[PDB]
Design a protein around this motif. Structure first.
Motif, PDB file in Angstrom:
ATOM      1  N   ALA A  48       0.855  -1.166   0.000  1.00 13.50           N
ATOM      2  CA  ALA A  48       0.000   0.000   0.000  1.00 13.50           C
ATOM      3  C   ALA A  48       0.902   1.230   0.000  1.00 13.50           C
ATOM      4  CB  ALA A  48      -0.941  -0.017   1.176  1.00 13.50           C
ATOM      5  N   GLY A  49       0.350   2.360  -0.446  1.00 13.60           N
ATOM      6  CA  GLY A  49       1.050   3.612  -0.398  1.00 13.60           C
ATOM      7  C   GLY A  49       1.907   3.839  -1.620  1.00 13.60           C
ATOM      8  N   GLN A  50       1.608   3.125  -2.716  1.00 14.28           N
ATOM      9  CA  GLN A  50       2.391   3.203  -3.926  1.00 14.28           C
ATOM     10  C   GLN A  50       1.479   3.311  -5.149  1.00 14.28           C
ATOM     11  OE1 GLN A  50       4.848  -0.276  -3.801  1.00 14.28           O
ATOM     12  NE2 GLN A  50       6.401   0.687  -2.505  1.00 14.28           N
ATOM     13  N   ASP A  51       2.063   3.834  -6.225  1.00 12.06           N
ATOM     14  CA  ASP A  51       1.492   3.720  -7.535  1.00 12.06           C
ATOM     15  C   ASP A  51       1.822   2.326  -8.097  1.00 12.06           C
ATOM     16  OD1 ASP A  51       2.086   5.397 -10.698  1.00 12.06           O
ATOM     17  OD2 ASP A  51       0.584   3.978 -10.109  1.00 12.06           O
ATOM     18  N   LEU A  52       0.784   1.510  -8.266  1.00 12.87           N
ATOM     19  CA  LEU A  52       0.930   0.142  -8.658  1.00 12.87           C
ATOM     20  C   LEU A  52       0.347  -0.076 -10.062  1.00 12.87           C
ATOM     21  CD1 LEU A  52       0.084  -1.557  -5.238  1.00 12.87           C
ATOM     22  CD2 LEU A  52       2.296  -0.902  -6.156  1.00 12.87           C
ATOM     23  N   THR A  53       0.363   0.984 -10.881  1.00 16.62           N
ATOM     24  CA  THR A  53      -0.187   0.944 -12.218  1.00 16.62           C
ATOM     25  C   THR A  53       0.449  -0.222 -12.999  1.00 16.62           C
ATOM     26  OG1 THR A  53      -0.633   3.328 -12.223  1.00 16.62           O
ATOM     27  CG2 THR A  53      -0.524   2.275 -14.357  1.00 16.62           C
ATOM     28  N   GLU A  54       1.779  -0.272 -13.026  1.00 17.62           N
ATOM     29  CA  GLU A  54       2.512  -1.301 -13.745  1.00 17.62           C
ATOM     30  C   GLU A  54       2.261  -2.682 -13.137  1.00 17.62           C
ATOM     31  OE1 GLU A  54       5.828  -1.766 -16.148  1.00 17.62           O
ATOM     32  OE2 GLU A  54       6.790   0.080 -15.389  1.00 17.62           O
ATOM     33  N   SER A  55       2.144  -2.752 -11.807  1.00 15.81           N
ATOM     34  CA  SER A  55       2.057  -4.004 -11.032  1.00 15.81           C
ATOM     35  C   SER A  55       0.825  -4.848 -11.388  1.00 15.81           C
ATOM     36  CB  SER A  55       2.068  -3.713  -9.539  1.00 15.81           C
ATOM     37  OG  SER A  55       3.268  -3.052  -9.155  1.00 15.81           O
ATOM     38  N   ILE A  56      -0.191  -4.260 -12.028  1.00 18.20           N
ATOM     39  CA  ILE A  56      -1.497  -4.937 -12.194  1.00 18.20           C
ATOM     40  C   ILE A  56      -1.365  -6.071 -13.227  1.00 18.20           C
ATOM     41  CG2 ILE A  56      -2.431  -3.462 -14.023  1.00 18.20           C
ATOM     42  CD1 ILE A  56      -4.357  -4.633 -10.843  1.00 18.20           C
ATOM     43  N   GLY A  57      -0.390  -5.936 -14.138  1.00 16.19           N
ATOM     44  CA  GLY A  57      -0.149  -6.858 -15.246  1.00 16.19           C
ATOM     45  C   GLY A  57       0.045  -8.298 -14.790  1.00 16.19           C
ATOM     46  N   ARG A  58       0.676  -8.467 -13.620  1.00 15.28           N
ATOM     47  CA  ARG A  58       1.011  -9.763 -13.050  1.00 15.28           C
ATOM     48  C   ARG A  58      -0.100 -10.257 -12.102  1.00 15.28           C
ATOM     49  NH1 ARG A  58       6.885 -10.120 -11.837  1.00 15.28           N
ATOM     50  NH2 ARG A  58       7.717  -9.898 -13.950  1.00 15.28           N
ATOM     51  N   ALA A  59      -1.039  -9.383 -11.706  1.00 15.50           N
ATOM     52  CA  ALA A  59      -2.135  -9.751 -10.788  1.00 15.50           C
ATOM     53  C   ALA A  59      -3.036 -10.793 -11.444  1.00 15.50           C
ATOM     54  CB  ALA A  59      -2.940  -8.526 -10.416  1.00 15.50           C
ATOM     55  N   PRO A  60      -3.745 -11.643 -10.658  1.00 15.04           N
ATOM     56  CA  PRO A  60      -4.750 -12.573 -11.191  1.00 15.04           C
ATOM     57  C   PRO A  60      -6.121 -11.918 -11.417  1.00 15.04           C
ATOM     58  CG  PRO A  60      -4.698 -12.776  -8.808  1.00 15.04           C
ATOM     59  CD  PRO A  60      -3.655 -11.736  -9.192  1.00 15.04           C
ATOM     60  N   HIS A  61      -6.104 -10.609 -11.667  1.00  9.12           N
ATOM     61  CA  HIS A  61      -7.289  -9.787 -11.760  1.00  9.12           C
ATOM     62  C   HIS A  61      -6.908  -8.513 -12.512  1.00  9.12           C
ATOM     63  CE1 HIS A  61      -6.065  -6.807  -8.734  1.00  9.12           C
ATOM     64  NE2 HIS A  61      -5.766  -7.788  -7.862  1.00  9.12           N
ATOM     65  N   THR A  62      -7.892  -7.643 -12.756  1.00 14.64           N
ATOM     66  CA  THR A  62      -7.635  -6.331 -13.388  1.00 14.64           C
ATOM     67  C   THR A  62      -8.042  -5.219 -12.407  1.00 14.64           C
ATOM     68  OG1 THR A  62      -9.688  -6.443 -14.688  1.00 14.64           O
ATOM     69  CG2 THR A  62      -7.698  -7.284 -15.737  1.00 14.64           C
ATOM     70  N   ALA A  63      -7.855  -3.970 -12.841  1.00 12.78           N
ATOM     71  CA  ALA A  63      -8.018  -2.787 -12.003  1.00 12.78           C
ATOM     72  C   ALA A  63      -9.491  -2.494 -11.704  1.00 12.78           C
ATOM     73  CB  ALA A  63      -7.357  -1.612 -12.673  1.00 12.78           C
TER      74      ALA A  63
END
Ligand code: HEM
Length: 76
Positions: A48-63
């Motif tokens: 938490a406390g970050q810009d995770l825009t790039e990080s979503i690509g690897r998530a098992p979900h979308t934004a």
């Protein structure tokens, strides 16, 4: 609606009673209360406390899942 710098956003890290905020595509979401984000950790990989825009690509979900949470501002 506030304007957050990344330095200020880092304070909202879900630790020691602080809210847990996450930025995505310029918008800051309050994810405090999401048990996925309590302690300001999200499934080991994410802080938490970050810009995770790039990080979503690897998530098992979308934004899409950010939509349930309040937007509290924009990130500088
Ligand atoms: C990092 C690659 C990453 C993982 C792994 C991850 C997992 C994950 C799971 C298993 C859920 C629960 C599914 C559900 O719909 O209930 C979940 C939920 C949310 N996530 Fe996530 N996630 C990863 C990364 C990210 C990143 C980088 C963000 C935001 C920028 C993000 C956000 C969310 C949100 C919001 C939810 C829903 C929370 C809720 O409904 O309480 N995740 N994630």
């Amino acid at each position: 609606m506030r304007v957050f710098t990344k330095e200020e956003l880092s304070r909202y890290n879900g630790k020691e009673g602080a809210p847990a905020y996450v930025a995505y595509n310029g918008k800051v979401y309050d994810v405090t209360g999401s048990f996925h984000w309590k302690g300001g950790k999200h499934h080991v990989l994410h802080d938490a406390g970050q810009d995770l825009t790039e990080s979503i690509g690897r998530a098992p979900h979308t934004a899409e899942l950010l939509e349930k949470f309040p937007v509290v501002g924009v990130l500088r």
